Amino acid sequence: AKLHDYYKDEVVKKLMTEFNYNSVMQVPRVEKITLNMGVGEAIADKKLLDNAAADLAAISGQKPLITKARKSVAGFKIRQGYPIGCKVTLRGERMWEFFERLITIAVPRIRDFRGLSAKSFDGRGNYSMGVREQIIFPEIDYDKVDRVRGLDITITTTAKSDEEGRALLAAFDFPFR
Amino acid sequence: DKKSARIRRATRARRKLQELGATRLVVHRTPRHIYAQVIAPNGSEVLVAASTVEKAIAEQLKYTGNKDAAAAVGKAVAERALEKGIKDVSFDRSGFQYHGRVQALADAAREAGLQF
Amino acid sequence: GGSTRNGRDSEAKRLGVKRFGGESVLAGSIIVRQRGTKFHAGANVGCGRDHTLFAKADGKVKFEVKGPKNRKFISIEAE
Amino acid sequence: GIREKIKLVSSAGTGHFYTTTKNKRTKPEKLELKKFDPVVRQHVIYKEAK
Amino acid sequence: MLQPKRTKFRKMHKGRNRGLAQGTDVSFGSFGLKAVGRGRLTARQIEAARRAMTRAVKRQGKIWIRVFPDKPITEKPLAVRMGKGKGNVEYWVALIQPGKVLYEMDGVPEELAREAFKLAAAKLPIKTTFVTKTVM
RNA sequence: GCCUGGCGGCCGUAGCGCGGUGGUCCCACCUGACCCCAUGCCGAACUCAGAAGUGAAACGCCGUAGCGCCGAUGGUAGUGUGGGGUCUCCCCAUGCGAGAGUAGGGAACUGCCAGGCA
RNA sequence: CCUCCUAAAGAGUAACGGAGGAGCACGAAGGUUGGCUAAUCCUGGUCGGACAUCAGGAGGUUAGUGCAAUGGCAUAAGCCAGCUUGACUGCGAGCGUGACGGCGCGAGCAGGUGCGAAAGCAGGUCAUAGUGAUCCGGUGGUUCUGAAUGGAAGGGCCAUC
RNA sequence: ACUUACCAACCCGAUGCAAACUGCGAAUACCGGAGAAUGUUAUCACGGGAGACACACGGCGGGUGCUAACGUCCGUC
Ligand SMILES: [Mg+2]
Ligand SMILES: [Mg+2]
Ligand SMILES: [Mg+2]
Ligand SMILES: [Mg+2]
Ligand SMILES: [Mg+2]
Ligand SMILES: [Mg+2]
Ligand SMILES: [Mg+2]
Ligand SMILES: [Mg+2]
Ligand SMILES: [Mg+2]
Ligand SMILES: [Mg+2]
Ligand SMILES: [Mg+2]
């Protein structure tokens, strides 16, 4: 909870007045957070995948679902139906908890850090950023690591426009430029 | 779509029940309400019905549309149908899984005297 | 580059038709490769493993056309 | 075509058996599974399959 | 010169060339050179004509070729026999029926246009005739 | 009578799009989730227990011809029979007669049961 | 042997006509119950690019179907999971298609079985290729026969090689 | 990163082509039902006896060939 709460008391408040929506329902809301690994190299390190996966597991509440290769193509050396990545969809409590440990204590550990980008918007109020080396997540035991890996989270919201989407995360501390 | 989904879920059975020509007991559910209809095989005329949306079946239920409520409607259409001598029918979940409040109402139907 | 060769016969196509004293259970229409060209309808169906439409009970052959956008359908009315 | 003719045999007395085939390689384990035995008019475990 | 860059099949049947033409009136340029006969212009023909046409107006004008081959036409070699497999695509033809508008031309005085068309005509195997734009 | 929901008929003159509009009730989103039951991860979906909020979304209704769709008349194409030619193609007599396009139609019609307000 | 055209809108239709496939696969790639729904393009996103996985939006079956072609498939016939062995034995009104040998489709009845709350579905696989008559001989079962009699050998019958 | 009298798919509008294209679609042919006239039953079955399985030209629709052949292969008269 917590951040969820912060959303209703303050935030919807914020966004209603920013855009004076008729209905509260009309106010953007973070729908889900879907963080994915994408091993690419399990095609040789079948074991690398399991690592990554257990990584996403650590970082995120629970069990990573591993994704096969939607279709085989020769470019990258991949047969169709080949375990070549793992992902995790976040909702309710676990989505918020991670939305927080994300901006609260992990986005900070990023390199030098100088802010996330606010142009990383798909055109319909949905985020997407990379992390290039997890570790920034305490849940990972540095002394037990095996590679830098890095994952990529993207935030899907009910916003209709980047204009709005931005404003939304804008209203959680959420870094940015 | 959700309601879209339910229908194609619902479509095969329906059709096989029409193929077989059989007065069917048709259930339909909603967050707040549960309805039941016994519908002649021509597909276009209902013989019997009952649902939590009727003053009576309701004027004595904690909440409409919940396991308990369902039950009432089951035993309802059950008797009502038995009233008109409509015995023997085929249950039609209409996309909803056979399990929920749907199973009651269904079960209640039997325990009332309905054949299926 | 070495052309030639061909399957053979197969017959196939409608065999009963229109009103017609389709007997107890005749193979009326045998355009297999279909279960589609024509669709199992009224008191005739089965539609056998090779999509063959046959009389499920004797009567007159029908042929109609329903509402999943056209869609053929052959059936058997009582005579 | 490489794939062999197996022979499933009635667990009951009966000299009865069904007749099929398995890919002996990919499926080395003697194939078991129930089928109808007409001399005993019952469903009995049939075994035997390479 | 001119022909399908690719073809679902290598060889066509032969069929027949009945009926009136379908692309029938000037709809790109201000003037046309219409068929008026039945038969088949071949590639080297549509070209020979095109050329003549062009070198004539010189620089100016625009040109449109409405017909285009796409028909295989084979030929059993010489002292080979009858039958043993169908022959080899040797050249391409476009079937053309009376009414077919063959060329259109654009940025040029009526006169010259006709002149040019008269010259391209003399390279064609079918009788032809000069058409103007028409309002409807 | 207006409104809504459910089960069908007909299966685009029934759709899509734009605009507008409705929430007492029905619908919907919605709230909660140990649990029934569920997530090849996720209460998204399935589901249970509810009802603080909203009709934003979706849904229904009203408008609207941008598109879709329907669509004459007249002519053209082809074609059975019988004749004929300048027989790779064509014409005449007679019967059948498209496709495309044109004018124009069109913002469905309809039955059973229930529920709400008049 | 199979699919398409040639084939003249029922079937059939030739050529040393035009084009391609088969001589297998699968105990799940069969059954059923429950569930789900591609391709392609635009946009955003660590390593990751034109193209591997994540998000959204258009799209709406151009995807998919073990395999050629065609015809089908959203109620899916495509995709997944649980439980399974109906890839059952005996039969079969009544059709197709063959000169014939034969091949093919089939509801329904009997016994017995799986899935499903039930209605119900299942006698393999979206369908149509994936094959070899007769003889002779082998293997199992079966007193049907068995050259004076009882047996046996051999013969028959059912399965199968 | 810009650019270039380079080529440029897709998309949009305009114009054609198809045996193995089809969101259309005939004429005829073929199947079924009734009916009347008319036909030395022309129909079907069973049985006795055959011959025949080298065809040709012509019309129409086609394949092959050169819309060559008193060519060649099918359909139909
Ligand atoms: Mg609207
Ligand atoms: Mg609204
Ligand atoms: Mg018309
Ligand atoms: Mg035919
Ligand atoms: Mg014909
Ligand atoms: Mg991209
Ligand atoms: Mg006689
Ligand atoms: Mg001979
Ligand atoms: Mg001969
Ligand atoms: Mg002959
Ligand atoms: Mg001759």
Curated annotation (Swiss-Prot), chain A:
* UniProt keyword list: Acetylation, Ribonucleoprotein, Ribosomal protein, RNA-binding, rRNA-binding, tRNA-binding
Q: Which Pfam families match?
A: Ribosomal_L5 (PF00281), Ribosomal_L5_C (PF00673)
Domain of life of the source: Bacteria
Gene3D superfamilies recorded for this chain?
A: 3.30.1440.10
State one molecular function term (GO): 5S rRNA binding
| One GO biological process term | ribosomal large subunit assembly
GO CC, sorted alphabetically, is: cytoplasm; cytosol; cytosolic large ribosomal subunit
**Record PTM N6-acetyllysine, positions in chain:** K2
Q: How does it assemble?
A: Part of the 50S ribosomal subunit; part of the 5S rRNA/L5/L18/L25 subcomplex. Contacts the 5S rRNA; cross-links to the P site tRNA. Forms a bridge to the 30S subunit in the 70S ribosome, contacting protein S13 and S19.
Q: What else is known?
A: Identified as a multicopy suppressor of the slow growth phenotype of an rsgA (yjeQ) deletion mutant.
Which family, according to UniProt?
Belongs to the universal ribosomal protein uL5 family.
The record, for PANTHER family, names: 60S RIBOSOMAL PROTEIN L11-RELATED (PTHR11994)
According to its UniProt entry, what is the function of this protein? This is one of the proteins that bind and probably mediate the attachment of the 5S RNA into the large ribosomal subunit, where it forms part of the central protuberance. Its 5S rRNA binding is significantly enhanced in the presence of L18.
* Entry protein name: Large ribosomal subunit protein uL5
Could you tell me which species this protein originates from?
Escherichia coli (strain K12)
Curated annotation (Swiss-Prot), chain B:
Keyword list (alphabetical) reads: Phosphoprotein, Ribonucleoprotein, Ribosomal protein, RNA-binding, rRNA-binding
Q: Does the keyword Hydrolase apply?
A: no
| Pfam families assigned | Ribosomal_L18p
Region span, Required for binding of the 5S rRNA/L5/L18 complex to the 23S rRNA? 1-16
* GO MF annotation, one: structural constituent of ribosome
Q: Give the PANTHER family listed for this entry.
A: 39S RIBOSOMAL PROTEIN L18, MITOCHONDRIAL, LARGE RIBOSOMAL SUBUNIT PROTEIN UL18M
The Swiss-Prot or TrEMBL record describes its family as follows: Belongs to the universal ribosomal protein uL18 family.
**Subunit text:** Part of the 50S ribosomal subunit; part of the 5S rRNA/L5/L18/L25 subcomplex. Contacts the 5S and 23S rRNAs.
What is the role of the protein in this entry? This is one of the proteins that mediates the attachment of the 5S rRNA subcomplex onto the large ribosomal subunit where it forms part of the central protuberance. Binds stably to 5S rRNA; increases binding abilities of L5 in a cooperative fashion; both proteins together confer 23S rRNA binding. The 5S rRNA and some of its associated proteins might help stabilize positioning of ribosome-bound tRNAs.
This chain's protein is named: Large ribosomal subunit protein uL18
Q: Which organism is it from?
A: Escherichia coli (strain K12)
Swiss-Prot record, chain C:
**Pfam families of this UniProt entry?**
Ribosomal_L27
Cellular component per GO, a single term:
cytosolic large ribosomal subunit
Q: Which gene encodes it?
A: rpmA
The protein in question is named Large ribosomal subunit protein bL27
Q: Which PROSITE patterns match?
A: RIBOSOMAL_L27
In terms of superkingdom, the source organism counts as Bacteria
- PANTHER family, alphabetically? LARGE RIBOSOMAL SUBUNIT PROTEIN BL27M (PTHR15893:SF0), RIBOSOMAL PROTEIN L27 (PTHR15893)
Signal peptide stretch? none
From Swiss-Prot, chain D:
The answer to whether UniProt assigns keyword Secreted to this entry is no
BP GO annotations: cytoplasmic translation; response to antibiotic; ribosomal large subunit assembly
Q: What would you give as a GO molecular function for this chain, any one? A: tRNA binding
Q: Which GO terms describe its cellular component?
A: cytoplasm; cytosol; cytosolic large ribosomal subunit
The UniProt keyword set, sorted, is: Methylation, Ribonucleoprotein, Ribosomal protein, RNA-binding, tRNA-binding
Assembly and partners are described as: Part of the 50S ribosomal subunit. Cross-links to the P and E site tRNAs.
Q: Which family does it belong to?
A: Belongs to the bacterial ribosomal protein bL33 family.
Q: What else is known?
A: Surface exposed on the 50S subunit.
Q: What is this protein called?
A: Large ribosomal subunit protein bL33
